[PDB]
Amino acid sequence: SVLTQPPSVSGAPGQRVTISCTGSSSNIGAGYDVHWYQQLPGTAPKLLIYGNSNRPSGVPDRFSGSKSGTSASLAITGLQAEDEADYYCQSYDSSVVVFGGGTKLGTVAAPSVFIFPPSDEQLKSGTASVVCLLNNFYPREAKVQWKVDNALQSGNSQESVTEQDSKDSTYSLSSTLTLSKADYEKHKVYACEVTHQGLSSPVTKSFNR
Amino acid sequence: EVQLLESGGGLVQPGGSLRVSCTNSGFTFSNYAMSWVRQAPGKGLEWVSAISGTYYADSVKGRFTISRDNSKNTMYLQMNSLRAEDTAVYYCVRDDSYDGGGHYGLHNWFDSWGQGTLVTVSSSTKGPSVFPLAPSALGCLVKDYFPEPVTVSWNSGALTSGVHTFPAVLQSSGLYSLSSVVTVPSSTYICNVNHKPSNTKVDKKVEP
Amino acid sequence: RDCSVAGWLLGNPMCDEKANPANDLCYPGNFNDYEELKHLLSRINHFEKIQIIPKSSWSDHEASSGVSSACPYQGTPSFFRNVVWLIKKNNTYPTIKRSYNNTNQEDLLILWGIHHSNDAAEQTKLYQNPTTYISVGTSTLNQRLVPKIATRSKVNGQSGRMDFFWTILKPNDAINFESNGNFIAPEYAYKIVKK
To answer: What is the CATH number of domain A1-106?
Structure first.
């Protein structure tokens, strides 16, 4: 199921990016075609290219496959924020089917930051968790700090990050700090400190019990 | 629309059995070959098997069985012996060929893709807990469920405005947790939550 | 050997006179003027096969494309070895300009083919162009072809048809193919010595 593909690309709007899909002389050194698939993040694959150069309808003219020897290439001209997906190439080898390993993909925004206290119901249940929100920033590299009375709390959080949004093209991240309610209520101040690229003097949002 | 529909998937134990039908309308079933393509969590696609006449990838051989009924215009995949690594969302797929009326898989592509139905191999079941993240952006969080998936709607579900439904976090508890949030500049709103295979439907109105 | 006549020339992956053969034409469609050729097809005391146009001559179209369930070789879809089925490239089927002057002082056996389809959306799938043609000429003869398109049965599992044609290209002469679609070009040809 693996041909070969680069892990991820990066590009700028309107610019051109080239997607390689390599392979042995066994499969693409055979002459079997290469097909591509554009699969939106949390959706089925959509047939992108077929027969190495051809596209079905609903597909833009900004997409062109080019097949060369044991390799093949997906190119895109006139980029858009609608084009963000995982791009896989498919081909056959001694039947079966083989796939690429896929390839993922500009103004700097400062992330809108928030901090959300715990619920009530979550308390009488059992333990308690605390969530910090960062909305719609670029770039992807970043960091979040949980400061309890300045104490940098390590061990207590897992954080998930949203795949780049379609039309704005901006990520968002929720950091969830999971605790034990007993070990929770002692102190008062609970913070979130965020350093972005657009930063200036850094930002820390918090609250009191 | 042209509808590929795969139904009946959920939690199975290792060494279990699962029969997944793909349900079809919009064309003539008998006139096309069909396939199954599966995608594991955080992974790409892997050919499972196809039928016009049956073909199978190597990882599934002898423990998977592909079967088509054009009388009822559906097709199955019988999965027994199922281990662990078999957990993937299952897309029922259309095989489309330059050479037309061919029933042939050899070289053709996949134009039409199913919606997908997640098969999970593990034990044991669960259902989530819905607590609000409350304002002076906002939304609610989902704690402690199993298996995946859940699904988050908003205000009866018709809201696409600044909404964020996060990637689920498999926790230390071995129980997925996550958050769905919305956005807004200044100032009743409910998130509508279903985790289907606990038979769970919950919706909680949010406000401070 | 196992084959018929025509397909054996076209190359017909299923075979490497014969009364009533298993494999004549693996893909359906007509055969234009079988009979005539048959007669002077024998009376040949000398024979060999050589190339004229490789698939590598075309940069503007997608060359190795058509191979079908109707023409497999050991369970794998293939095509008449010597004929070449041409598909659009990059969503585009530029009109073909190609000519072959016979520099050999020995004569030449020439054949080519036309693919008939059913739906014109399906025509749009392969050749991209709704209305196509084929026109060829040598010296005496000038041919003009158009695909007939409505719908059809399943013969050889296939709903489409393929008509093939033949000629004899004199030495120090040429042959001129013109098509923007629905065309099956040659690859290898036959040197012929008559009785």
So the answer is: 2.60.40.10
